[PDB]
Structure 1
């Protein structure tokens, strides 16, 4: 096809992954400057995970109870603090591989790369999207907590995600790098319901736009529509209501492809009702919503770092 789900080069982020062990529990940590960030439920035993009292379990723990390993070397913890749901460990050495970074909280629909880590060593990288119900559909096993989601632009690394748990529906939930969970989720072993998920509409439109340059044009039609009428049929199929803001982001894409945004909305409208009839767009037989407009522009123009 010529279009793939591709993640940022994980070079900068690999230099910050460390191992954090507390008692018998071990997970990944993010070593930036002289601080290491990790999920706070590292101080939890298997019995404590059913209903923890984190402020009560933390005070029992001390600096020497936290062992940080950066590969085969040891870090010495000279202070600890709880910020919401992340643990902050102050070490005596500043990470020589700390990049120009930034702690951001992303919005639903936005994408980011995930460096899946186990025991502080990188395992794999993949692209992910913040679902509108504030979950992510990742690939995580036990010991994956502490892995981070990040974006990179030019030279800066924006850490936006840290992994914490898996929901009963198999999806995943985590926090930003300040400990605040994405969504109405808490860190304890209880049945937690994610809301009714939806489809990021502006993302599907950017994907259909990407398909036009890459050869697939069979879904294109000659019908057009209006912004309202599209939203009326988008509500029924569990899609986000497109706004004038959404159209403005799809703007430069429509100027390159030469097909107006409202024309593209009509093609998706008919794709929504008429189905796919067994055909494929860009190799997929479903409608992809994990490509932002900026993602489509980045891959069809080749922005590097």
Structure 2
């Protein structure tokens, strides 16, 4: 029992992290087969970051201006190219530790594990969600760029995030592994702001189910609301609107608990309007929105009476 924000074991991704130097800048890269992926702003100097012309910066480079290290093993760079906001370095050696992998672009509300790295070395792992404003509420310092987010299904690693920068409100932005940014952000050291961040309603509901399964049930109401009725309250408290597809996703959690989904919505409604009266839910004083319904299912398996 118990219920924790849990990250995937990071060993497979650790086997892919390398150090990428260009000029005087070191950050992290991802070594898959014979390609190293990393943020293109590794070619900037500290003078270049207000409005870099990345094409112009890159034609000034050659393979000799990149140093890639996989641990103490040197990787000879034999090609480079720029795809959107990621640099792809071709190297003379395919990574023998390459897992089965995919590149996927996740939707807001979906979670993933982050392996934070500095100078090519894994430093920590933790669980994150793509927020509705396309930021990540992470923990990153200077030198973390090129850290990646991922999920593991079976033995296949789905890479979904590569980290580029920190917005001044203390949240983080980055790209998929094809280099397309999540959200309206660009890789420059300019003034940009996260949009208003809303709460992921479906995930809050899944977390409440997790609380019920683990015995925390003080907040339930035998009351049924409607989708339209709930959504009026949702917009008042800056919650993502709830769709019928959200209700479908929560069907299995609903069967295991014997609490219908619109009952749980009425329970969540009452928490929004009245607060939690000084009690906690799963050790938390806030409504938690970074567990997906699948994340809850993996961690709270139960017998079904038939």
- CA shift, 1:168, in A, is 1.4
Question: Conserved in 1, the CA contact under 8 Å of 2:164 and 2:175?
Answer: yes
Q: Is the Cα contact below 8 Å between 2:37 and 2:89 reproduced in 1?
A: yes
The CA deviation string for residues 49-71 of structure 1, in whole angstroms up to 9 with x for no partner, is 12210000000011000110000
Q: Distance in 2 between matches of 1:198 and 1:157?
A: 29
Deviations 1:114-143, CA, capped at 9 Å, x for gaps: 000001110000000000000000000010
Measured against aligned partners, the alpha-carbon deviations of 1:185-234 in whole angstroms (never above 9, x if no partner) come to 10010011111110000000000000001010000112221111111100
Q: Deviations over 1:143-192 (max 9, x none)?
A: 00000000001110000000000001111000000000000010010011
Gaps of 5+ in 1: none
> Partners of 1:302 and 1:263 in 2: how far apart?
21
State the distance in 2 between where 1:243 and 1:35 align.
Answer: 41
Q: Alpha-carbon deviation of 1:302?
A: 9.6
Query: Aligned to 1:168, what secondary structure does the other structure show?
Result: coil
Paired residues of 2:220 and 2:264 also in contact (CA < 8 A) = yes
CA–CA distance in structure 2, aligned partners of residues 31 and 9 of structure 1? 18
Task: Give the secondary structure class of the aligned counterpart of 1:102.
Answer: strand
* Paired residues for 1:5-84 under 5 Å: 5-84=5-84
Q: In 2, Cα distance between the equivalents of 1:194 and 1:56? A: 29
Question: Deviation of residue 47 (structure 1)?
Answer: 0.6
> Does structure 1 retain, via aligned residues, the 8 Å contact 2:34–2:92?
yes
In 1, Cα distance between equivalents of 2:260 and 2:227: 12
Deviating runs (4+, > 4 A) in structure 1? none
Distance 1:224 1:244 in 2: 15
In 1, the alpha carbon distance for the partners of 2:278 and 2:229 equals: 26
How far 1:301 moved relative to its partner?
A: 2.5
Paired with 1:302 and 1:87, the residues of 2 have a C-alpha distance of 45
Contact 2:200 2:239 in 1 (8 A): yes
Question: Any gaps of 5 or more consecutive residues in structure 2?
Answer: none
TM-score, scaled relative to structure 2: 0.98
2:281 and 2:184 map into 1 onto residues whose CA distance is: 35
Q: Deviations over 1:35-94 (max 9, x none)?
A: 000000000000101221000000001100011000001001111000000000000100
Quote the Cα distance in structure 2 between the aligned partners of 1:193 and 1:139: 18
The SS at the match of 1:230 is helix
SS at match of 1:9: coil
RMSD: 1.2
SS in 1 for 2:49: helix
Counterpart of 1:162 in structure 2 is 162
Q: How many residues align?
A: 303
State whether residues 128 and 290 of structure 2, in contact with CA within 8 Å, keep that contact through their aligned partners in structure 1: yes
Contact 2:135/2:172 (<8 A) preserved = yes
Structure 1 range deviating more: 223-232 or 242-251: 223-232
